[PDB]
């Protein structure tokens, strides 16, 4: 679990390259399982910048 | 006219082994027929697939 903006969740999935598969979270070429995702712009932004 | 018949047996598995080394350089609907052209120019589950 972990957030991210919205267009790198297109990174979390096996077999992807760019940064955040590269050098933040990895999926292996055999994963088994869900990614889930939503927008959370109400919980994690603040103004000033979170 | 004779010696044909050893001839051929020497022929016959000569043009076997061309046949053999030749398939080599075909596609198989592959990008390429080189092995190392395809891994070097593709990602990882694009690279297996071809």
């Not at chain 1, 969740?9 to 077999?15: E, F, H, N, W, Y």
């Not at chain 2, 080599?24 to 596609?27: Q, T």
């Given at each position: 679990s972990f957030v991210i903006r919205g267009d790198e969740?297109?990174?979390?999935?096996?077999?992807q390259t760019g940064k955040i598969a590269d050098y933040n979270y990895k999926l292996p070429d055999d994963f088994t399982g869900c990614v889930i995702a939503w927008n959370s712009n109400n919980l994690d932004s603040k103004v000033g910048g979170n | 006219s004779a010696l044909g018949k050893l001839q051929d047996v020497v022929n016959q598995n000569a043009q076997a082994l061309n046949t053999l080394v030749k398939q080599?350089?075909?596609?198989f609907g592959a990008i390429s027929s080189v092995l190392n052209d395809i891994l070097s120019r593709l990602d990882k589950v694009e690279a297996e697939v071809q």
């Open positions: 969740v297109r990174q979390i999935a096996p077999g | 080599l350089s075909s596609n």
